[PDB]
């Protein structure tokens, strides 16, 4: 699953 | 299950704007930002900036604050990239892509003329 | 602006064995305890294919076969086996700071 970490979520 | 299809290449104008188009399918987009890149062979892979559909709010990268304009619509859930005043460094493939930065479209082919 | 350099520019590997493709970031991509280094695929006239993410994650659909290692600011993608279908341009991104960032690629080749 990469929609929480593929980006920075800040 | 997610789909991002991109609109058909484009042979633009000098001077001239084009509006690019991402219609996402099994996905709802405002549950995640839309994010725009730009392909060149030469100066290579560029990320111009992230919409977020959810609140229209936008964030470019500095040297694409005056050329492109994302705005989204989650009524259909359609992503748009305006490009104005083309130029020729314009010319590239344009891609969106969202969940995270996983899922991307096709590409949008955008030519020139001289 | 963090700028990725990749290393090396292009590469032809033997059938089977393994490679390393290497990217370095100009500052950190880390934070809190996460490196924010994707990897992507890229063959031509197809879109960019997400590979690793956060460093040392495998994407969903994407073959064992590909890791990533690393923090700060040095990464490295291993293939191994490298198998036919792995010719293509492999690219580093961060996305820890705004604007995201790309390397400038590695075409690797079999032999």
């Known amino acids: 699953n990469a929609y929480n970490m593929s980006i920075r979520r800040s | 299950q997610v789909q991002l299809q991109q609109s058909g290449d484009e042979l633009v104008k000098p001077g001239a704007s084009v509006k690019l188009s991402c219609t996402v399918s099994?996905?709802?987009?405002?549950?995640?930002?839309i994010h725009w890149m730009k392909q060149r062979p030469e100066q290579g892979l560029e990320w111009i900036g992230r919409?977020?559909?959810?609140?229209?709010?936008?964030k470019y990268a500095p040297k694409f604050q005056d050329k492109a304009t994302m705005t989204a619509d989650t009524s259909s859930n359609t992503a748009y990239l305006q490009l104005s005043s083309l130029a020729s460094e314009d010319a590239a493939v344009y891609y969106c892509?969202?969940?995270?930065?996983?899922?991307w479209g096709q590409g949008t082919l955008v030519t020139v003329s001289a | 602006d963090i700028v990725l350099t990749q290393s090396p520019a292009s590469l032809a590997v033997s059938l089977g064995q393994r490679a390393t493709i290497s990217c370095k970031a100009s500052?950190?991509?880390?934070?809190?305890?996460?490196?924010?280094m994707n990897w992507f695929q890229q063959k031509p006239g197809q879109s960019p294919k997400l590979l690793i993410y956060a460093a040392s994650n495998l994407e969903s659909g994407i073959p064992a076969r590909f890791s990533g290692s690393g923090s700060g600011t040095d990464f490295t993608l291993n293939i191994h086996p490298v198998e036919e279908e792995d010719a293509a341009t492999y690219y580093c991104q961060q996305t820890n700071e705004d604007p995201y960032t790309f390397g400038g690629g590695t075409k690797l080749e079999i032999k």
């Open positions: 919409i977020d559909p959810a609140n229209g709010y936008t």
């Open positions: 099994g996905f709802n987009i405002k549950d995640d930002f």
């Open positions: 892509a969202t969940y995270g930065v996983a899922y």
């Open positions: 500052q950190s991509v880390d934070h809190d305890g996460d490196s924010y």
